[PDB]
Amino acid sequence: EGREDPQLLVRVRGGQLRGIRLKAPGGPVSAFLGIPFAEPPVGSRRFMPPEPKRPWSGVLDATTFQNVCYQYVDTLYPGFEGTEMWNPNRELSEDCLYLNVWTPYPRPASPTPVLIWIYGGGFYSGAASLDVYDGRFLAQVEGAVLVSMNYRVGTFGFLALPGSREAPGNVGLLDQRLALQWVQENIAAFGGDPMSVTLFGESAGAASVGMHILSLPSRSLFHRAVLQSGTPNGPWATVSAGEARRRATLLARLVGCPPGNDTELIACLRTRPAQDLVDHEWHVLPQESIFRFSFVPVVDGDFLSDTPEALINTGDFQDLQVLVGVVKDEGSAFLVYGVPGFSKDNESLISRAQFLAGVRIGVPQASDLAAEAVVLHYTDWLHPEDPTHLRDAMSAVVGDHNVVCPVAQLAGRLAAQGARVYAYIFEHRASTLTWPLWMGVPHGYEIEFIFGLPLDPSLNYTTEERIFAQRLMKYWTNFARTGDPNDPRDSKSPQWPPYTTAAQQYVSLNLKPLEVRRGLRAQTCAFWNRFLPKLLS
Amino acid sequence: EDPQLLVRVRGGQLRGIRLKAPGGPVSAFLGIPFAEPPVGSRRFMPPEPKRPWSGVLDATTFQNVCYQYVDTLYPGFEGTEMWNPNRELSEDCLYLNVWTPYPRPASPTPVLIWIYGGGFYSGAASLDVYDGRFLAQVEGAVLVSMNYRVGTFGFLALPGSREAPGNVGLLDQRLALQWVQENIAAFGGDPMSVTLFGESAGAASVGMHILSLPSRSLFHRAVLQSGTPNGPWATVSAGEARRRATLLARLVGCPAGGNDTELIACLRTRPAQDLVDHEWHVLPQESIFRFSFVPVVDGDFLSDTPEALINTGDFQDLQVLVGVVKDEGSAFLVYGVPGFSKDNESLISRAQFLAGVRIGVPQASDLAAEAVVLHYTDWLHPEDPTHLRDAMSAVVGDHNVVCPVAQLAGRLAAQGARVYAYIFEHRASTLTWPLWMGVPHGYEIEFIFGLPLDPSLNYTTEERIFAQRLMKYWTNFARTGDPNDPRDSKSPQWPPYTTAAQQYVSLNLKPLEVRRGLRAQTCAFWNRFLPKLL
Ligand SMILES: Nc1ccc2c(c1)c(-c1ccccc1)[n+](CCCCCCc1cnnn1CCNc1c3c(nc4ccccc14)CCCC3)c1cc(N)ccc21
Ligand SMILES: Nc1ccc2c(c1)c(-c1ccccc1)[n+](CCCCCCc1cnnn1CCNc1c3c(nc4ccccc14)CCCC3)c1cc(N)ccc21
């Protein structure tokens, strides 16, 4: 046939695809949703590296989002858009290694910069099919080819018996590398420039992006990287070999797979229903905690030849261009998932006791001395009992420790070692946010703006937000295009300068024009990055 | 003979001198002896009261300065010399001075007693900056200052011994205090309204009288300026004093030991200058704002450590005035911290800053020292010399003065005392120290004493009015326990310092500003965290 829209028929290397023509506000875009890039990682392939997708015959239908990787569904606030917007919107299946491509309609005559999105979700949840990752706007408005992939999360993606053949760990990264490889090979068929691939992701996806920066076999598959609210370095994005070994073994035991070599154990895990692994995942953490996740990248001496901090300290990043940044309230969201005293349904004014308790959960790896050091640092000694400040300090601790200071260390090390870094703080609370006021601009809530959702008039964003969304997409795609988020023509708008060790410049993203600022929580991050380590004894 | 200049005290008759103050005449009784000269066998010993004398004792001049180390850092430089002895040195130095109004006050006047500082190793009540003349004349106060023994002579202790029990300098002071109870009325002072006030070491001495029950009946109120009994430099342990006494004895040929009595006997046979010669050689570490012989925690004068005493004391009917100058640490830097001098802007390196902290917090472990550095670095301008220099100064001032002051203020206030706190931020126009030193340790005294009221000293009109303000606060404080002017009904009120609000006031040329929290975050570092690095 024959009768179909010729713009929707594309041949990639596994065979032919039929895409779908979608409405964006400013006009039509092409979508090729659910292109499979790996062999379904099921049965004997669980815990195993992805294998490239074997070619198919006929025209593969690529008009709808394919399955979401097997994962824990958040039931903290039943019916609450604030949590439900992050939950899976397609069937849960182990057969989920699919990707998506948005492109202009009609596809552009000459090659186009390619953004590749990697979702977040604590390496345990996430799905490229979620409303907030909808590439139609970037495609229609900026003329960009945008690609997002599903990668295996949780045990399926990250359970590791390091040194083993049957479960070597890091397979979720490997799924992402494979989507990356696929783009090199096929994106041209859609008018993307494979010589201009920019990786971007937020939170665990941001951490992912950083891992690709740090893994030799991924460096050839992209040219530019964007890390939103996450990093490879830090207390949560990786575990050591021993700790991953401990967690896998403990989970194995929990589902009735007693540990005594690795083959028997992994074989037994492979016989277990996927829902059983998910049901037991949370139980392997070493302490009561927040912003920690059971199955995450392992420092395997393979994908990661050393710890991320060792590699950012000694890596040569002679031109790499990265844009890094944070939201105003990185910590706030985490507090409702565990910390007593905190809730979305009230003001969360906590007591000093609740605060000391929170710091323990919030910095679980820290001794008595160190936890008391954090508390002394974040206490306002002028009002040391004030419920509002205590609440906000709890939020700042979780935020600073897990996101802001890792981001600061990242920028600093990169910049000091050849990279062109652009740094930002995103301060706009959405008008449409359902979370309470006290949470500020929570973790994840710049994404809807970077992706352009406010441009959809049916979504009820303000005109200001629509103009803002447009500004943001211009920064992002200018950066993709050029390595520089500035417009080479628009001299009147204030310029966004690179981040450097000498001046530590970064910009505010809010409804007002760009304001340049110096030092990203410089003083407090000296605490977390330089001092708190030295409380090693 | 002028009857106004003739007083009979318990030991006999005294002849004063009428002195010229700007606004009128004052009566001075200088060099009154309050103790048997603590010489020969009485060296290292508590003071005995002065024996009665015959006829009329000439009290028209300052008496000898207690034997001390004379500063030779910058010879003849005003900034340093103004602290050096301005009379002959002598172990025979237990003399006090009284300035009173001319004529003698008609009714009992509040009495204000000054105790100089000098790191318990130097000082003298005869120094130009402690001139009682102005407060006498202008505010009508009877002002009293004593010499007390310093250095080995005042504070060498072999604790538990009969012949060198330690703290005798403090006992000298206590005896001057007793003398005031017994005699001041004779000069028109009210023995029922005595305010102790002192700066630096003198401030810590005042603090020690607060914490020592036998001193408490000799005064009703206190003022601690840039100094505290608590904190890193004002006391030593019994074991630590023993060690330095012993080491000093070794350094001068004495006697090894063997026997306390024997060791002290030998020390007593040594010329004063021999003791001073080796005074500086007994410190455990390279350091600054540490002093060889200082009060000892004897379990007698000081029943426990000042820390223990302020934590658990009852200070219900006590009024205290405490404060600090803007740049407590700056002066100390020129005394041994490499890279610092008065003769240039002193723009140090990072290495110099890290080396300075070791010196500055001598007791500090490797980790504790790094905690300090990481706390005081401006992570935005990490290697800027101006920032490092100012930081080095801040470290020393905070560690030794401001946070100790902050801690004392809070304990007292929590435990019944009525506390008023200040930061003094005016740089005297006459200052011969360089700009980068700011308002150095000890340059508020000048103002409190009323020196800018003497037109010959070339202070500005502004400064004379500022000095007048200050004398009103202090003497209002002596008068009532409240530095506020109960006449002026037109703000801005100086509020009591409390744990809750932490209110204190800026003392500068502009009218009182009320600030809250005296380096609250930085002193949490120093007072709460840092102990926990044991
Ligand atoms: N009784 C049980 C049984 C099993 C599990 C349970 C509890 C909990 C838990 C729930 C409530 C309170 C305490 C613990 N967690 C807690 C995981 C921590 C969730 C923190 C929020 C977060 C952080 N990154 N991804 N997510 C998941 C939710 N998706 C979001 C995302 C983002 N931002 C936000 C912001 C607000 C709310 C949600 C949200 C941004 C990036 C992508 C996802 C789990 C974590 C596991 N790894 C496995 C099982 C369970
Ligand atoms: N070669 C030798 C031999 C013997 C001694 C020597 C050096 C030094 C020294 C000198 C220069 C550099 C390094 C060490 N100090 C250290 C002096 C420590 C005091 C530093 C400043 C200070 C603090 N409190 N009193 N003083 C003495 C100077 N008097 C002042 C005072 C005050 N303010 C100031 C302000 C600026 C300059 C001086 C000054 C206010 C209160 C009273 C005195 C001594 C200390 C001793 N305890 C014994 C002997 C010597």
A142 as an active site residue: the answer is: no
- Out of B441, B444, B446, B463, the active site residue is B441
Q: In whole angstroms, what is the distance from residue A342 CA to residue B125 CA?
A: 62
Nearest by CB: A534 against B370, B502, B532: B370
A203 as an active site residue: the answer is: yes
Distance between start and end Cα atoms, chain B? 66
Cis amide bond preceding A340, omega within 30: no
Q: In whole angstroms, what is the distance from residue A162 CA to residue B29 CA?
A: 89
**Element counts in chain B: helices (H) and strands (E):** 19, 16
| Cβ contact A398:A291 at 8 Å | yes
Q: In whole angstroms, what is the distance from residue A209 CA to residue A510 CA?
A: 25
If 0-12 CB within 10 Å is exposed, 13-18 middle and 19+ buried, where does residue A499 land? buried
B383 as an active site residue: the answer is: no
Proximal ligand: closest to the CA of A87: 1
Q: In whole angstroms, what is the distance from residue B6 CA to residue B8 CA?
A: 7
Torsion sign over Cα A266, A268, A272, A278 = negative
Q: How many CB pairs under 8 A join A and B?
A: 39
For residue A62 the two structure tokens come to 């690529």
> How many Å lie between the centroid of ligand 1 and the Cα of residue A403?
16
Q: In whole angstroms, what is the distance from residue A281 CA to residue B481 CA?
A: 67
| Cβ contact B326:B441 at 8 Å | no
Other CB atoms within 10 Å distance of the CB of residue B271: 10
Q: In whole angstroms, what is the distance from residue B346 CA to residue B339 CA?
A: 6
Contact list, B521 vs chain A (CB under 8 Å): 381
| Cβ contact B353:B391 at 8 Å | yes
**All residues at 6 or more sequence positions from A448 whose CB lies less than 8 Å from its CB, including other chains:** A132, A430, A454
For residue B23 the two structure tokens come to 């606004």
CB contact under 8 A, A534 and B380: no
Residue A368: closest C-alpha in chain B: B532
- Measured from the CB, is residue A442 less than 6 Å from ligand 1? yes
Pairing of strands B65-66, B89-90: parallel
> How many Å lie between the centroid of ligand 1 and the Cα of residue A71?
11
Pairing of strands B221-225, B319-325: parallel
The torsion of the CA quartet B451, B456, B460, B462, rounded to 10 degrees, works out to 50
Cis amide bond preceding B117, omega within 30: no
**All residues at 6 or more sequence positions from A502 whose CB lies less than 8 Å from its CB, including other chains:** none
Q: In whole angstroms, what is the distance from residue B241 CA to residue B262 CA?
A: 17
3-state secondary structure of B423: strand
Select from A375, A381, A516, A520 the residue whose CB has the most chain B CBs within 10 Å, as the one to mutate to test that interface: A381
Q: In whole angstroms, what is the distance from residue B386 CA to residue B339 CA?
A: 12
The full DSSP string for A212-225 is: HHT-HHHHTT-SEE
If 0-12 CB within 10 Å is exposed, 13-18 middle and 19+ buried, where does residue B239 land? exposed
Torsion sign over Cα A200, A206, A209, A214 = positive
Q: In whole angstroms, what is the distance from residue B324 CA to residue B438 CA?
A: 13
Q: In whole angstroms, what is the distance from residue B532 CA to residue A369 CA?
A: 8
Closest CA to A250 of A273, A278, A283, A279: A283
3-state secondary structure of A472: helix
**All residues at 6 or more sequence positions from A193 whose CB lies less than 8 Å from its CB, including other chains:** A111, A112, A113, A114, A145, A187
CB contact under 8 A, A531 and B370: yes
Strand order in the sheet with B319-325: B17-21, B24-33, B95-101, B142-146, B109-115, B189-199, B221-225, B319-325, B418-424, B503-507, B513-516
**Element counts in chain A: helices (H) and strands (E):** 18, 14
Residue with the smallest CA separation from ligand 1 atom 10 is A337
Cis amide bond preceding A106, omega within 30: yes
CB contact under 8 A, A373 and B528: no
The torsion of the CA quartet B444, B450, B456, B457, rounded to 10 degrees, works out to -10
CB contact under 8 A, B524 and A376: yes
Q: Please, after which residues is chain A broken with C–N above 2.5 Å?
A: 259
Torsion sign over Cα B309, B312, B313, B316 = positive
3-state secondary structure of A478: helix
Pocket test for ligand 2, best of B335, B396, B427, B436 (most atoms within 8 A of CB): B335
- Measured from the CB, is residue A124 less than 6 Å from ligand 1? yes
Residue B462: give its domain's CATH number: 3.40.50.1820
For residue B43 the two structure tokens come to 């060296």
The full DSSP string for B35-52 is: B----GGGTTSPPPBPPP
CB contact under 8 A, B380 and A530: no
Nearest by CB: A522 against B379, B502, B520: B379
Give the distance from CA A479 to its chain's centroid. Answer: 18
For residue A288 the two structure tokens come to 């009561």
DSSP state of A298: B
If 0-12 CB within 10 Å is exposed, 13-18 middle and 19+ buried, where does residue A57 land? exposed
Contact list, A369 vs chain B (CB under 8 Å): 532-533
Q: In whole angstroms, what is the distance from residue A150 CA to residue A127 CA?
A: 6
CB contact under 8 A, A525 and B379: yes
For residue B444 the two structure tokens come to 């508020």
If 0-12 CB within 10 Å is exposed, 13-18 middle and 19+ buried, where does residue A379 land? buried
Q: In whole angstroms, what is the distance from residue B166 CA to residue B155 CA?
A: 5
The full DSSP string for A183-204 is: HHHHGGGGTEEEEEEEEEEETH
The CA-based diameter of chain B, rounded to the nearest angstrom, is: 72
The type of residue at B175 is L
Other CB atoms within 10 Å distance of the CB of residue B50: 20
Q: In whole angstroms, what is the distance from residue B168 CA to residue B35 CA?
A: 12
CB contact under 8 A, A382 and B525: no
Cβ–Cβ contact A523 with B under 8 A = yes
The full DSSP string for B462-489 is: HHHHHHHHHHHHHHHHHHHS--S-SS--
Task: Tally the domains of chain A.
Answer: 1
E-strand ranges in A402-496 read 420-426
Pocket of ligand 2 (CB under 6 A): B 69, 71, 73, 80, 83, 117-119, 121-123, 199-200, 279-280, 291-292, 331-332, 335-336, 440-442
Strand order in the sheet with B56-58: B6-9, B12-15, B56-58
A215-222: long-range contacts, CB 8 A cutoff, minimum separation 24: A215/A173, A215/A177, A215/A303, A215/A304, A216/A305, A217/A177, A218/A177, A218/A180, A221/A177, A221/A180, A221/A181, A221/A183, A221/A184, A221/A197, A222/A116, A222/A180, A222/A197, A222/A198
Helix (H) / strand (E) element for B274: namely: helix B272-277
Cβ–Cβ contact B506 with A under 8 A = no
> How many Å lie between the centroid of ligand 2 and the Cα of residue B326?
20
| Residue B203, phi then psi, degrees to nearest 5 | -75, -40
Contact list, B525 vs chain A (CB under 8 Å): 376
| Residue A190, phi then psi, degrees to nearest 5 | -115, 5
The torsion of the CA quartet A165, A169, A173, A176, rounded to 10 degrees, works out to 50
Nearest by CB: B529 against A376, A522, A526: A376
The type of residue at A9 is L
> How many Å lie between the centroid of ligand 2 and the Cα of residue B335?
7
**All residues at 6 or more sequence positions from A1 whose CB lies less than 8 Å from its CB, including other chains:** none
E-strand ranges in A336-470 read 420-426
E-strand ranges in B380-417 read none
**All residues at 6 or more sequence positions from A491 whose CB lies less than 8 Å from its CB, including other chains:** none
The full DSSP string for B429-450 is: TT--S-GGG-SBTTTTHHHHTT
Ligand 1: nearest atom to the Cα of A445: 33
Q: Which domain holds residue B83?
A: 1-534
Distance between start and end Cα atoms, chain A? 72
**All residues at 6 or more sequence positions from B239 whose CB lies less than 8 Å from its CB, including other chains:** none
Residue with the smallest CA separation from ligand 1 atom 37 is A83
Pocket test for ligand 1, best of A68, A71, A74 (most atoms within 8 A of CB): A74
For residue B414 the two structure tokens come to 């929590």
B385-397 helix and B366-376 helix, angle to the nearest 10 degrees: 120
Q: How many CA atoms lie within 13 A of B456 on its CB side?
A: 3
The type of residue at A439 is M
**All residues at 6 or more sequence positions from B375 whose CB lies less than 8 Å from its CB, including other chains:** B522, B525
Cβ–Cβ contact A525 with B under 8 A = yes
| Residue A38, phi then psi, degrees to nearest 5 | -130, 165
- Measured from the CB, is residue A303 less than 6 Å from ligand 1? no
Method: X-ray
Residue with the smallest CA separation from ligand 1 atom 4 is A282
Nearest by CB: B528 against A376, A504, A519: A376
Q: In whole angstroms, what is the distance from residue A181 CA to residue A166 CA?
A: 23
Other CB atoms within 10 Å distance of the CB of residue A410: 27
Q: Please, after which residues is chain B broken with C–N above 2.5 Å?
A: 255
> How many Å lie between the centroid of ligand 1 and the Cα of residue A167?
25
Residue B503: closest C-alpha in chain A: A382
Closest CA to A71 of A42, A94, A48: A94
For residue B531 the two structure tokens come to 């102990």
- Residue A266, CA distances (Å) to A54, A135, A480, B155, B529 in order: 25, 38, 41, 76, 48
Q: In whole angstroms, what is the distance from residue B421 CA to residue B409 CA?
A: 8
Q: In whole angstroms, what is the distance from residue A493 CA to residue A96 CA?
A: 44
Pairing of strands A27-36, A98-104: antiparallel
SS (H, E, C) B172-217: HHHHHHHHHHHHHHHHCEEEEEEEEEEECHHHHHHHHHHCCHHHHC
Experimental structure resolution, Å: 2.7
Location of structure tokens 């629509």 = A466
**All residues at 6 or more sequence positions from A417 whose CB lies less than 8 Å from its CB, including other chains:** A312, A315, A316, A317
| A 356-415 → B contacts, CB under 8 A | 369, 372-373, 376, 379, 381-382
Proximal ligand: closest to the CA of B152: 2
| Cβ contact B168:B149 at 8 Å | yes
Torsion sign over Cα B123, B129, B130, B133 = positive
The type of residue at B337 is V
Q: In whole angstroms, what is the distance from residue A101 CA to residue A36 CA?
A: 11
If 0-12 CB within 10 Å is exposed, 13-18 middle and 19+ buried, where does residue B378 land? middle
| Cβ contact B109:B141 at 8 Å | yes
3-state secondary structure of B507: strand
Q: In whole angstroms, what is the distance from residue A488 CA to residue A479 CA?
A: 11
| Cβ contact A58:A171 at 8 Å | no
Proximal ligand: closest to the CA of A334: 1
Nearest by CB: A518 against B370, B371, B380: B380
- Measured from the CB, is residue A76 less than 6 Å from ligand 1? yes
Residues in a beta bridge with A425: A326, A508
The type of residue at B400 is N
- Out of B122, B193, B200, B292, the active site residue is B200
Contact list, B384 vs chain A (CB under 8 Å): none
Cis amide bond preceding A108, omega within 30: no
**All residues at 6 or more sequence positions from B521 whose CB lies less than 8 Å from its CB, including other chains:** A381
CB contact under 8 A, B528 and A504: no
Proximal ligand: closest to the CA of A403: 1
CB contact under 8 A, A381 and B521: yes
| Cβ contact B445:B332 at 8 Å | no
Closest CA to B37 of B48, B28, B26, B22: B48
